[PDB]
Amino acid sequence: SSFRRFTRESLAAIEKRMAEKQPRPQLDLQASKKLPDLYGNPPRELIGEPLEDLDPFYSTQKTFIVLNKGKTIFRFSATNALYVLSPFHPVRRAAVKILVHSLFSMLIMCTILTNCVFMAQHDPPPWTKYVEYTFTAIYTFESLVKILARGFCLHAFTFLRDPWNWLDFSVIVMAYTTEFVSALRTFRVLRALKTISVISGLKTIVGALIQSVKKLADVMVLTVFCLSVFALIGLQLFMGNLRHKCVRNFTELNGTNGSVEADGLVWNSLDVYLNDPANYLLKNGTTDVLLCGNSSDAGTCPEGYRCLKAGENPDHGYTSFDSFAWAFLALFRLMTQDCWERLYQQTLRSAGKIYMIFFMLVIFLGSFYLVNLILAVVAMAYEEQNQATIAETEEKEKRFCCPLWMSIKQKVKFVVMDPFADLTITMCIVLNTLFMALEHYNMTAEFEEMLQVGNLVFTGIFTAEMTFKIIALDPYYYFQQGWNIFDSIIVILSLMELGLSRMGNLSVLRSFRLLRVFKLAKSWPTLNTLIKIIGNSVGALGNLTLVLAIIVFIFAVVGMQLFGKNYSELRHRISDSGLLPRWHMMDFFHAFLIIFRILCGEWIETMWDCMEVSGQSLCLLVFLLVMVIGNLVVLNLFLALLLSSFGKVWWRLRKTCYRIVEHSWFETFIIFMILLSSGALAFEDIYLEERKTIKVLLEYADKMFTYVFVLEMLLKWVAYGFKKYFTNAWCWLDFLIVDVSLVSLVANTLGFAEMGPIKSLRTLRALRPLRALSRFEGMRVVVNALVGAIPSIMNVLLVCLIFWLIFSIMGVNLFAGKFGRCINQTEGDLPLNYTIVNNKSECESFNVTGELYWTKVKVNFDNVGAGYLALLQVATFKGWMDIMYAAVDSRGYEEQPQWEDNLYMYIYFVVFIIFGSFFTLNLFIGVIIDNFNQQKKKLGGQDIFMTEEQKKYYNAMKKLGSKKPQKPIPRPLNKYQGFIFDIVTKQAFDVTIMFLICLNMVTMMVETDDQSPEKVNILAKINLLFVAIFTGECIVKMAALRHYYFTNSWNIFDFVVVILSIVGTVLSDIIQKYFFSPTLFRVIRLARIGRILRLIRGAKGIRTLLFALMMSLPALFNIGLLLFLVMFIYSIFGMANFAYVKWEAGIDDMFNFQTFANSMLCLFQITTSAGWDGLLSPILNTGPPYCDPNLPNSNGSRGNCGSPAVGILFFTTYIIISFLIVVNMYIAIILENFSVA
Ligand SMILES: *[C@@H]1O[C@H](CO)[C@@H](O[C@@H]2O[C@H](CO)[C@@H](O[C@@H]3O[C@H](CO[C@H]4O[C@H](CO[C@H]5O[C@H](CO)[C@@H](O)[C@H](O)[C@@H]5O)[C@@H](O)[C@H](O)[C@@H]4O)[C@@H](O)[C@H](O)[C@@H]3O)[C@H](O)[C@H]2NC(C)=O)[C@H](O)[C@H]1NC(C)=O
Ligand SMILES: C[C@@H](OC(=O)c1ccccc1)C1=CC[C@@]23OCCN(C)C[C@@]12C[C@@H](O)[C@]12O[C@]4(O)CC[C@@]1(C)[C@H](CC=C32)C4
Ligand SMILES: C[C@@H](OC(=O)c1ccccc1)C1=CC[C@@]23OCCN(C)C[C@@]12C[C@@H](O)[C@]12O[C@]4(O)CC[C@@]1(C)[C@H](CC=C32)C4
Ligand SMILES: CC(C)CCC[C@@H](C)[C@H]1CC[C@H]2[C@@H]3CC=C4C[C@@H](OC(=O)CCC(=O)O)CC[C@]4(C)[C@H]3CC[C@]12C
Ligand SMILES: CC(C)CCC[C@@H](C)[C@H]1CC[C@H]2[C@@H]3CC=C4C[C@@H](OC(=O)CCC(=O)O)CC[C@]4(C)[C@H]3CC[C@]12C
Ligand SMILES: *[C@@H]1O[C@H](CO)[C@@H](O[C@@H]2O[C@H](CO)[C@@H](O)[C@H](O)[C@H]2NC(C)=O)[C@H](O)[C@H]1NC(C)=O
């Protein structure tokens, strides 16, 4: 009834309606949406035909509606298209019929996919010109349909009205313009964006992505403000420090126009001499110029070398603090924590070791807090649209031999359904995934046969279960749920591998039997959650994954044809020695890998190579665009998955010691000893034997510490009950520590020192700091929080252990003994060509001069135990470079590697990261969030990481943030004071002050290392004007008030910053006429960022976000008290174990474990899980030709080798322990951010 064929009388009626016409359309009637069944199913004769409009909102105007077989509402234009085409024209009727046809949409979709394939081919064949013409013809043909059906721009719903249709018009007009330097074809890849327009599902997701980034202006402004403020701090502190180089010593010849000579050569001038790169000193191992510093903490050049400022720069010239432009980039990289340890070591080496305080604040105030603030908002923004989407569903519902065969069929059915049969199958699955885990590199004939024989017996059992199941219930009913389907495909996949094994030279399908371990999800709940996370990404979140896949492909082909030509021609400017670059862009597969590497968080490493090849300006835009856009989609996908898927004497003495134990003076006495005993541990450096008076003093102190603590335990034992002491977990912790100390002391006095087990027990003195946990309530409440999560953490670790067991066994099968390289020690650690040494047999054949060592990668796939460490390094993105490089080079069993031979081994590492590092991490954070949410509810809706006293202060300080607008200040009746009051209280005065802050902020970015005296004087004069006017505006605003400086707390911040600026601006003039400050002048110069910090008053969004950090300050302090204690404990472990190790990649002469100061620097670097692979490598190696045992050492030890056993345990546990504590910090801000919203 409602639907009818369009008629001219109906058009005239709509005209009359518009006539007397000269407040919201219905959601259910919007375009590209399904029509409700209330109006009725359109007849087959009316589908694809013009029908009158249904919504009264558009009834006034000339609009009409069509529907397809799928009943999608389409609103076209009824006004004359192109001024000649009436809506009733037969050609227009044919055009609109083909526009709504679902077959037409599939035609465009298939064409785009074919075009996307043809755009990924570098150096296309010359016959593709017709294909480009055909794609141009098709795209113009479908574009002409829109013009022939809707108009061009004139009437409401038209072609160039929806923003997405501009893309099609731009593509066709640009394609024809090209048909009417060759790098301008990069615009043709925009045809891949048309996929989003074709699929209606993808369009809404893109709209959701824009909304997510729209709710980020306050955070993005704060992020830019924080980075710019920190850049000015870094600029004024390390201005030109990175240019320090160990220039060779020289002497100046007398006369001869000031010529300078080297040891044997002569240079014309000092400028020419020093700028030469052949007289510097390269760092050991790497090809890096060794930085230095005149400070007492920075590095030192060896004999014959001196520290001089002049030089080019580190990292080809792109890593410097000389200008604000470089300072911003060098600190945005710190914000992302992409290779930040390289800048961490370079700045400490050049400036000094004390400057790690600056890196601590940048990593916290700029990286840890700000990135988490970004992630907190995206989760908040998604929760807002998720609620609305669910709300739109709620309102929709409110409105609305045969008898023998049968006899044996039921008999086997009885056996199959029996629960013991299923349990044995699960037990068989567990054994099968464990028997085949007994795979290593150096096998034997018997072991390989036993493992091979075990394959058929396990495969044969599964076939019998499948054979019995297909006949038991029903052949058709057997398929049913996918659990039965999944078993069928896997069991027949193994049979294909076994049948192929007769000719199976390349057998890898046997590694797919591990997928049967997923059958354990029936009983395991956590395994089910992991499957649901993966299923949601391909299921309900299919569109979001498709958008990410589409975006990654586009950025892969954008860079392939933009930098592909330059990479091939200028490969020598980025080649290691003489070969191709490892990460180039001349091929699509390598182009995609760089995009994937950028998504993983490593961008600047490949940015330097591209900037040195193609162009600095262009490479900066593309690499940063994929960094912002790529992470925005990935973070949206990661957060979407997480939220969607989730006698009287005895009595008398007992009372006396009870009183003394409970006395407060006793409690602080023990705390004093706990801190002192922990402090003396760090004193045992490698120079202890040199200091004769400190080694005996520490030994006496150790005796006193173990005598006081024993007395304390005895007093508690006598006073408190035996059950009371042993029922307290904290008291048990102290009991073990003292027991270890007592055993070591009693063994030393017994004359049984320096033995095997006793000497290992002395190292366990590093657990002495653990006694401080039970005393400070700030740390005890944090420990109480992580103890409650131990059952939840253990469940996730088992699932990740099973998930990583599949990849480790599969990785062992793919690579086992293929990581061996026959290196030549005379040259260096460089694999040789196969034209000389082909395998291990040939390497030993030429082993006549004793210089060919068949070494192997320290972290490799030789067995499941060794494979677990490699997966950990790959998943953590630390040290994975040396794994993929040695894996995409494998050339068979015990064969010499070749450049990119077996190149597609990169796919194995990419898939693992998507599954074992992305989805696995998503499961862990989801469980931890769920667990700690339960603890908050269990505790009574109170913060978990906060003490009782801190709660009072935080609650009291929370009320301080209440906005209570006070009454206006009375006008002073001094005429002149009243006049200045009127011109000051006006808000326009604050705008002028705010404008002056930006000008002062701008004039500090002009600072550069190459500062001429004329530029210095002009800037000094400009600063003098700024400090004068600011004092003037402070002296007139205060003059009007004169009695209420206490109120408006921002009015005291500017008063002290002006006084500080007044002190600074007069000391600088004094300093020029007084003793020159070597480094104190930098501080007073740098103390001017207070003016920049005055912008908080005028920014509401910035102030609110900063208020959340102040809320989370007491919570973060408690968590950080524990992390530093753990870092302190591990540092003492490092000095006792990893001292006197060979200096190598991660262990320089300044970042070793010899001293507490040096070990503290290393552990802070590993706290962010950065560069832990580089530090682990010098411990893993043992024996020649890498290490050299039987080497004399000062502290009794011998040999500079490493300990692979404890070296792996030390770094693996600390990486995990730090991550849990860091995660505790990530959510503490989020909960505070959610509450403050
Ligand atoms: C090719 O041919 C060479 C020479 O025959 C082989 O090199 C030897 O390989 C064996 C193992 O197969 C090594 O034996 C090991 O020796 C350890 C004791 O240390 C020995 O060398 C120490 C000297 O230091 C060496 O390394 C440093 C660098 O760290 C160099 O600067 C030195 O020049 C030395 O090369 C000394 O203490 C002393 O010489 C020791 O003998 C021992 O702890 C191990 O258990 C093992 O027995 C041997 O050291 C290697 N070199 C020597 C001296 O012969 C090479 O393996 C062959 N490669 C193949 C596979 O073809
Ligand atoms: C964050 C994540 O990815 C990145 O690092 C990353 C960096 C830049 C851009 C994008 C991503 C991690 C890499 C691996 C990891 O490494 C430790 C340090 N990181 C910070 C934490 C992660 C995640 C952790 O849950 C953990 O992953 C596990 O699979 C499960 C539990 C885990 C503790 C186990 C051991 C190491 C893990 C194994
Ligand atoms: C730098 C940063 O590291 C990370 O946690 C981190 C996490 C993820 C990625 C990268 C890095 C820190 C986060 C919190 C911290 O504790 C953790 C350990 N680090 C080394 C030191 C920081 C910073 C410190 O200034 C400190 O922050 C405070 O808020 C103020 C002073 C502080 C000493 C107090 C106690 C602990 C702090 C509390
Ligand atoms: C994630 C979605 C929105 C896709 C984003 C794609 C853009 C990052 C690409 C698409 C087209 C590209 C442009 C295509 C062509 C050129 C011309 C090029 O200059 C030339 O004249 C060619 C090179 C030369 O000869 O020097 C500079 C880069 C630029 C603007 C490219 C910049 C990067 C663009 C905008
Ligand atoms: C009963 C359940 C709770 C046991 C859980 C054990 C797991 C925590 C796994 C994870 C990693 C495993 C380790 C991985 C590798 C090895 C090396 C393995 O020794 C070798 O085969 C040498 C390998 C080499 O160095 O080449 C001995 C077992 C061990 C310590 C494994 C012991 C069991 C571990 C700790
Ligand atoms: C290992 O590397 C060296 C080069 O560092 C190869 O060349 C030898 O180098 C030494 C020292 O310069 C010369 O004295 C020899 O005459 C060189 N031998 C030659 C010509 O090969 C050395 O050959 C390599 N080791 C091998 C392959 O035995």
Author numbering: 11 to 32, 53 to 210, 216 to 435, 700 to 945, 1190 to 1780
Can I see the authors' text?
For structural studies, we used the construct rat NaV1.5c with deletions in the DI-DII and DII-DIII intracellular linkers, and the C-terminus (rNaV1.5c) in order to enhance expression and improve resolution in structural analysis. A total of 86,763 particles were selected for refinement and 3D reconstruction, which yielded the final map at 3.3 Å overall resolution according to the Gold Standard Fourier Shell Correlation (FSC) criterion of 0.143. Therefore, our rNaV1.5/BTX-B structure is most likely captured in an inactivated state with the VS activated and the pore closed. Two equally strong (~10σ peak) density components with a shape similar in size and form to BTX-B were observed simultaneously in the central cavity of the PM at the level of the fenestrations, where the local resolution of the map is ~3.0 Å. We designate these two BTX-B receptor sites as Site IIB1 for the site in the DI/DIV interface and Site IIB2 for the site in the DIII/DIV interface, reflecting their functional roles as BTX-binding motifs in Neurotoxin Receptor Site II. Remarkably, K1421, which is part of the conserved DEKA locus in the DIII P-loop that forms the selectivity filter for sodium ions, interacts with the carbonyl oxygen of the benzoate moiety of BTX-B through an unexpected water-mediated hydrogen-bonding interaction (yellow). Moreover, F1420 adjacent to K1421 forms an orthogonal (T-shape) π-π stacking with the aryl ring of the benzoate moiety of BTX-B that likely provides substantial binding energy (yellow). The binding of BTX-B causes local induced-fit conformational changes in the rotamer of some key amino acid side chains. Notably, F399 and F403 from DI-S6, and F1667 from DIV-S5 adopt a “down” rotamer that allows for the binding of BTX-B in Site IIB1 (blue: Supplementary Fig. 6b). The binding of BTX-B to both Site IIB1 and Site IIB2 appears to stabilize the π-helix conformation of the DI-S6 and DIII-S6 segments, and the α-helical conformation in DII-S6 and DIV-S6 segments near the flexible gating hinge GGGS locus. Our analysis revealed that both BTX-B sites are compatible with the open state channel and require only changes in the backbone of flexible gating hinge regions and in the rotamers of a few side chains in the open state to avoid clashes.
Voltage-gated sodium channels (NaVs) initiate action potentials in nerve and muscle. NaVs are composed of four pseudosymmetric, homologous domains (DI-DIV) having six transmembrane segments each (S1–S6), which surround a central transmembrane pore. In all of these structures, the central PM is composed of an extracellular vestibule, a narrow ion selectivity filter, a central cavity, and an activation gate formed by the intracellular ends of the pore-lining S6 segments. The poison dart toxin batrachotoxin is exceptional for its high potency and toxicity, and for its multifaceted modification of the function of voltage-gated sodium channels.
